[PDB]
Design a protein around this nucleic acid. Structure first.
Ligand SMILES: [Mg+2]
Ligand SMILES: [Mg+2]
Ligand SMILES: [Mg+2]
Ligand SMILES: [Mg+2]
Ligand SMILES: [Mg+2]
Ligand SMILES: [Mg+2]
Ligand SMILES: [Mg+2]
Ligand SMILES: [Mg+2]
Ligand SMILES: [Mg+2]
Ligand SMILES: [Mg+2]
Ligand SMILES: [Mg+2]
Ligand SMILES: [Mg+2]
Ligand SMILES: [Mg+2]
Ligand SMILES: [Mg+2]
Ligand SMILES: [Mg+2]
Ligand SMILES: [Mg+2]
Ligand SMILES: [Mg+2]
Ligand SMILES: [Mg+2]
Ligand SMILES: [Mg+2]
Ligand SMILES: [Mg+2]
Ligand SMILES: [Mg+2]
Ligand SMILES: [Mg+2]
Ligand SMILES: [Mg+2]
Ligand SMILES: [Mg+2]
Ligand SMILES: [Mg+2]
Ligand SMILES: [Mg+2]
Ligand SMILES: [Mg+2]
Ligand SMILES: [Mg+2]
Ligand SMILES: [Mg+2]
Ligand SMILES: [Mg+2]
Ligand SMILES: [Mg+2]
Ligand SMILES: [Mg+2]
Ligand SMILES: [Mg+2]
Ligand SMILES: [Mg+2]
Ligand SMILES: [Mg+2]
Ligand SMILES: [Mg+2]
Ligand SMILES: [Mg+2]
Ligand SMILES: [Mg+2]
Ligand SMILES: [Mg+2]
Ligand SMILES: [Mg+2]
Ligand SMILES: [Mg+2]
Ligand SMILES: [Mg+2]
Ligand SMILES: [Mg+2]
Ligand SMILES: [Mg+2]
Ligand SMILES: [Mg+2]
Ligand SMILES: [Mg+2]
Ligand SMILES: [Mg+2]
Ligand SMILES: [Mg+2]
Ligand SMILES: [Mg+2]
Ligand SMILES: [Mg+2]
Ligand SMILES: [Mg+2]
Ligand SMILES: [Mg+2]
Ligand SMILES: [Mg+2]
Ligand SMILES: [Mg+2]
Ligand SMILES: [Mg+2]
Ligand SMILES: [Mg+2]
Ligand SMILES: [Mg+2]
Ligand SMILES: [Mg+2]
Ligand SMILES: [Mg+2]
Ligand SMILES: [Mg+2]
Ligand SMILES: [Mg+2]
Ligand SMILES: [Mg+2]
Ligand SMILES: [Mg+2]
Ligand SMILES: [Mg+2]
Ligand SMILES: [Mg+2]
Ligand SMILES: [Mg+2]
Ligand SMILES: [Mg+2]
Ligand SMILES: [Mg+2]
Ligand SMILES: [Mg+2]
Ligand SMILES: [Mg+2]
Ligand SMILES: [Mg+2]
Ligand SMILES: [Mg+2]
Ligand SMILES: [Mg+2]
Ligand SMILES: [Mg+2]
Ligand SMILES: [Mg+2]
Ligand SMILES: [Mg+2]
Ligand SMILES: [Mg+2]
Ligand SMILES: [Mg+2]
Ligand SMILES: [Mg+2]
Ligand SMILES: [Mg+2]
Ligand SMILES: [Mg+2]
Ligand SMILES: [Mg+2]
Lengths: 246, 61, 92
RNA sequence: UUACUGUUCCCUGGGAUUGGCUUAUUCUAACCUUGUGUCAGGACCUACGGGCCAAGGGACAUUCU
RNA sequence: AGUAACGCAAACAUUGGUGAGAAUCCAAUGCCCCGAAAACCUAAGGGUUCCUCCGCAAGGUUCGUCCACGGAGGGUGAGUCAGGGCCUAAGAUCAGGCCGAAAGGCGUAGUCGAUGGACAACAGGUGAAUAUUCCUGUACUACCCCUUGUUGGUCCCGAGGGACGGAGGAGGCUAGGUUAGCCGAAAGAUGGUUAUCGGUUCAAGGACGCAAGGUGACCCGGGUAAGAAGGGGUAGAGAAAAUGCCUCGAGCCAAUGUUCGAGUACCAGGCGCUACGGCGCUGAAGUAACCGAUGCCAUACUCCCAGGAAAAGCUCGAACGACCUUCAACAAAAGGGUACCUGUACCCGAAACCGACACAGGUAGGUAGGUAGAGAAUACCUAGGGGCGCGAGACAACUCUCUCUAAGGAACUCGGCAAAAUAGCCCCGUAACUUCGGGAGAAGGGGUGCCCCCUCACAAAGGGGGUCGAAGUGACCAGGCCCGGGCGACUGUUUACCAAAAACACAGGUCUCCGCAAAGUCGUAAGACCAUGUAUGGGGGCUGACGCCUGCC
RNA sequence: GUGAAACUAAGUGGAGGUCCGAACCGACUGAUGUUGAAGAAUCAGCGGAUGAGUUGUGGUUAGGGGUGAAAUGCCACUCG
RNA sequence: AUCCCGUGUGAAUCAGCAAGGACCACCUUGCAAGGCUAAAUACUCCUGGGUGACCGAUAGCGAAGUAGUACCGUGAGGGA
RNA sequence: GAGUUGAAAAUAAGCAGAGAUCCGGAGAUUCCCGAAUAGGUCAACCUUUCGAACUUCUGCUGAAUCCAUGGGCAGGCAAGAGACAACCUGGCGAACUGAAACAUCUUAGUAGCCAGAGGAAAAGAAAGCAAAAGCGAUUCCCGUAGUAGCGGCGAGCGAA
């Protein structure tokens, strides 16, 4: 319970200047922040699951952990988890769901999530609901694996990760029945640029329902909206990429 | 039950107006320090119209 | 040990008030009316009357006029008598 | 706007920042990134940060011309 | 041009008085209006408009002896109300630090910052103008003194706690209301009559304690072993806390209630005085039943997804570190004593704020009576406040706001614009079509008052009989309906001041970009948002529920 | 009801960008006013009225800009 | 050319270097990459004195009286 | 050097040839806000341990880290801060306009903003002008001269 707090970055979408950078953010119901442990430190101790709580700040559920020393933590909810299951973070830990260990000690073809790219920062990849990363192979310094996007990235071997697939896979199946359910999440109505005036969007003017009237569809800031790859050329992580998603 | 178009002054509290037009607000920025320089050379009696103390009969609380 | 503010203790009491209501208050409440400095307090006024006339002060109540002049109701203990002290000054 | 002349974002080459051994690939020492790793005053910095030690990149890139 | 108008169609009228002078000022009587306000408080704001005396130049849309006007003087009393001396959110500043022609920008701790949290009072009386502020009575908070005991404490630090949503309805109470009873008074020129009129009231707080209410393991009432609230002990990095283990414990929860406070206090009425103001004595009864909250128990319970602030006060407790000390410090009961700053007037559904006006307007929140009624709608009334700041006559056209209008009934008209009609409750009966939810109150018909009985009133409804009227939800209040087609799916949003739509949005669908030091966006830069998120996610373009489909280059 | 389910009748429950309708927020039609009582109001009806609701207090975004369920609309009766 | 900067390169020391309007030669002149320095000069919110073919209350400073007052505006500000 | 207690009479009391009132020089006090600077703040107020905050100066002590740095303590009417019409210096740096349009150009290195400083500032004691003859720091005025030149060789600009 003490891991929950109300100290959050109020004023979503607004930067320090106070101008809207990330549009269509506002309203929505209030939500407290949960402290989830992604590093999975405090190794070589058993901890059992008791609750499966609701986290408004994400798509997946969480799980409360109770260790023998009295500490309490939050983690993501794997798929086939049930109350009473144990979890361990270590090196010689057996390879089953809920446990955490580096990629060196894992076999090939494992369902993995909560992957970290660097040591200490904690897991960053494969957090969403129903997310999973398949380990393809490993060779010497680093280890390649597949991501939910279908891309094959080359991650270091000493990085930690959690086994299994994230819970509540069946969340896309429900369709938001009406617009009010969208505003409850904090997503304001999206206006189309073709309806605007020319000063506001390049597609604006023209009597009637105007077509694009341009060589290509464009963003509100002039650049095209389709096909142009936005990845920075000669990026630091360019050698760690094996292929492109699909 | 709709206010007319010309009601731009809805009798807001003087506490907030001092925080927006008060003496301490002008002395913070460089422009406000020059603002008072213009009103003193002008010779105006009341330099800041929208100002009130923290206590006394003028206090908004 | 410090007072609240620092100023002339002998300026705390400018002059009394002479009205038909004030004189009526002396006999009913055993009180006295005095105009006081704006920077004055109930402690300094309580200590003041204890030293000038050598009498006890049951309670002190004050207020600031619209003109920025402070007034002070001073109720003496029942042992003394404000009417007797009034004649010592000259006012009835 | 496929009017004229220009500016900016962005891409690319030469030069500086910028170095070593090999036949373009490697190496670590500049430089980039990170630490809930550690030390620190009267005290705290698990509050940014500083010093130290490590980890991942690496003379590419960022920056200037 | 002495022309228009003098700011609602709530309504004035008489007597008497004041005075040089009165439709306009004062009083009395009667009439009429508001009465979820046109009533009483109160926040912001205004800033002396409040009270008394004097005056009437100007101001008041008339008058004026009056006034929110003018002059003079006076008036706002707090340990408990509100705010500060306590805390913090949004947000604003920011030691150092980073960035930058300058100004300066970003930003860490920290500090400011109520619209929140925390914290101690009521009744009655006094009255030119103030009182939960003054007086009386009864309480509370903090500090100090005193008396014993303890004899290391106080900060830092650790932990607990504070600490929270919406919707829904049930139950137990009270406020409040009605009636009855009791007490007192009354003849209100009428046919009769007392069946009429009035009163029947009291808080904060202290002390006690609760179900037939809610909760707490065990059965179809009994039995029984763990088990609730609430405590204790123990192990490990290990004081508290947390986690695990063991153990005691049938009672717990709190609005209400009882009693004191609470006196012949308050009070109808009566006896006398008067300059008619009130004063001075006297002062009975002071109970019960029914109805019953939108308020209390109550972040009590149930359900649901959108998943519902922080800090301090408070409580528990070791070590390290800091300060101080044998009382000079901590802690317990009684008693006694002591008690900072500012606001407090007056208006506040307005003539004093906001609208240039004494403007048919706008202005958060609290209190919420009686009859009928589902109701805070509506109609008439109580408390209380008002009669709208020019009037008197006359009763042409014409205009506006309203009522009825023979026969006909949309022939009017761009157009059934406007007006008229419908209307409630209880029964009967309800189509095509459909996404099976709807359509639907479909449509369309019958009944409706009062009195007696059935009937035991079973809170009702129903049945039978009788009776009045042209007319029974008789007033106010209170749906018009049906067939067909186009657009858009629908609830919603939009050009404040000529356009509410077929436009926008919408759930959904599709394409494309982004592997986190992310894309994108704002910045000279540092950096910020995106995100304390991680491809079931984020940004962007088009389309716009659903159903059948979405071709060729 | 079945082998178990599917399915199905009652009762309980009280959901909804649900219905009628005051306050509150809005402003569709018409009349009146149009040197107005009023620089957008009065009167009579009308729409939503547990929600994408309304509102107070205290704040944020400032012009080669901001904001915009997007009208070139709003940003102190002033906005291509 | 002379003078002053960003980027990148990079000399010489009197037998020398720079300048003399691309540059070379000869001659002349001068000695950069350190610094300070009065006077003649420009201005009037003001002070004292003096003088006006300057105004005389719609003039002259906005202002001959409580003028940057009254008044208007959220404010900057405008302004009798 | 004879009457006085402002404008500003009146009233009530004083001072004064033992030389007042008044006029000058040097001093004292100088409440609150304000650079504001004990802390906070809605300027003229609040809370307070009662303090010129911060930077600088003079000392003491001496983190990571040996020397050091950064902190901490104390002293010290204690240097600096802010204000200031115009002129002056430096930095940023327009547009309408003119060219009968307009971009090179002009308006213009003007306006305005920021910063700083003085009564003046800035400049300034030849790595200079000049041309075969000579001058001997800088600045200002006359004049050279609207000349030599620059310029979509256009408008216009303009030396020594
Ligand atoms: Mg449009
Ligand atoms: Mg465009
Ligand atoms: Mg177009
Ligand atoms: Mg077309
Ligand atoms: Mg309203
Ligand atoms: Mg007071
Ligand atoms: Mg470190
Ligand atoms: Mg750190
Ligand atoms: Mg005429
Ligand atoms: Mg006429
Ligand atoms: Mg008129
Ligand atoms: Mg007339
Ligand atoms: Mg009526
Ligand atoms: Mg009055
Ligand atoms: Mg008159
Ligand atoms: Mg008159
Ligand atoms: Mg008056
Ligand atoms: Mg209080
Ligand atoms: Mg700083
Ligand atoms: Mg901060
Ligand atoms: Mg604070
Ligand atoms: Mg508050
Ligand atoms: Mg308090
Ligand atoms: Mg009153
Ligand atoms: Mg808690
Ligand atoms: Mg009779
Ligand atoms: Mg323990
Ligand atoms: Mg009062
Ligand atoms: Mg009052
Ligand atoms: Mg109101
Ligand atoms: Mg009104
Ligand atoms: Mg008006
Ligand atoms: Mg009623
Ligand atoms: Mg009504
Ligand atoms: Mg009535
Ligand atoms: Mg009248
Ligand atoms: Mg009137
Ligand atoms: Mg009238
Ligand atoms: Mg007819
Ligand atoms: Mg016809
Ligand atoms: Mg016809
Ligand atoms: Mg109609
Ligand atoms: Mg009708
Ligand atoms: Mg029907
Ligand atoms: Mg139909
Ligand atoms: Mg109706
Ligand atoms: Mg047609
Ligand atoms: Mg629609
Ligand atoms: Mg609609
Ligand atoms: Mg319109
Ligand atoms: Mg509409
Ligand atoms: Mg319209
Ligand atoms: Mg629209
Ligand atoms: Mg990025
Ligand atoms: Mg469309
Ligand atoms: Mg609805
Ligand atoms: Mg409705
Ligand atoms: Mg609207
Ligand atoms: Mg209406
Ligand atoms: Mg309605
Ligand atoms: Mg309707
Ligand atoms: Mg509807
Ligand atoms: Mg601004
Ligand atoms: Mg501009
Ligand atoms: Mg406007
Ligand atoms: Mg040269
Ligand atoms: Mg030459
Ligand atoms: Mg030379
Ligand atoms: Mg003049
Ligand atoms: Mg004249
Ligand atoms: Mg200060
Ligand atoms: Mg300060
Ligand atoms: Mg000094
Ligand atoms: Mg200065
Ligand atoms: Mg130009
Ligand atoms: Mg031109
Ligand atoms: Mg021209
Ligand atoms: Mg000077
Ligand atoms: Mg001089
Ligand atoms: Mg000079
Ligand atoms: Mg000089
Ligand atoms: Mg110099």
């Amino acid at each position: 319970n003490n891991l929950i707090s109300g100290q959050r970055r109020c004023g979503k979408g607004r930067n320090a200047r106070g101008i809207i950078t990330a549009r269509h953010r506002g309203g929505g119901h209030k939500r407290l922040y949960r402290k989830i442990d992604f590093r999975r430190n405090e190794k070589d101790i058993y901890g059992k699951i008791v609750t499966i709580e609701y986290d408004p700040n994400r798509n997946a559920y969480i799980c409360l952990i109770h260790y023998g020393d009295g500490e309490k933590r939050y983690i993501l909810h794997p798929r086939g988890a049930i109350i009473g299951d144990t979890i361990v973070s270590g090196t010689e830990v057996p390879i089953k769901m809920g446990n955490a260990l580096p990629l060196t000690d894992m076999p090939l073809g494992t369902a993995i999530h909560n992957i970290e790219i660097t040591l200490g920062r904690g897991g960053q990849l494969a957090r969403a609901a129903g997310a999973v990363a398949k380990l393809i192979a490993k060779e010497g310094k680093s280890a390649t694996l597949k991501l939910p996007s279908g891309e094959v990235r080359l991650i270091s071997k000493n990085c930690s990760a959690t086994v299994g697939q994230v819970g509540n896979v069946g969340v896309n199946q429900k369709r938001l029945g009406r617009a009010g359910s969208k505003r409850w999440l904090g997503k304001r109505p999206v206006v189309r640029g073709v309806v605007m005036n020319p000063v506001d969007h390049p597609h604006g003017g023209g009597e009637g329902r105007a077509p694009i009237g341009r060589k290509s569809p464009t963003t509100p800031w002039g650049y095209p909206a389709l096909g142009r790859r936005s990845r920075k050329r000669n990026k630091y992580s360019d050698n760690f990429i094996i292929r492109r998603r699909s | 039950g709709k206010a007319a178009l010309c009601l731009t002054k809805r009798s807001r509290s003087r506490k907030s107006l001092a925080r927006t037009h008060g003496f301490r607000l002008r002395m913070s920025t460089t422009s406000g320090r020059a603002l008072l320089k213009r009103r003193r050379a002008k010779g105006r009696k009341i330099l800041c119209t929208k100002t009130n103390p923290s206590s006394g009969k003028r206090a908004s609380p | 040990k410090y007072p609240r503010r620092i100023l002339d203790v002998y300026q705390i009491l400018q002059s009394p008030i002479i009205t038909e209501a004030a004189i009526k208050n002396i006999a009913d409440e055993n009180s006295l009316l005095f105009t006081v400095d704006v920077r004055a307090d109930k402690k300094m006024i309580r200590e003041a009357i204890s030293n000038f006339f050598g009498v006890k002060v049951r309670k002190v109540n004050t207020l600031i006029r619209p003109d920025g002049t402070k007034k002070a109701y001073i109720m003496l203990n029942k042992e003394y008598n404000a009417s007797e002290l009034a004649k010592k000054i000259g006012i009835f």
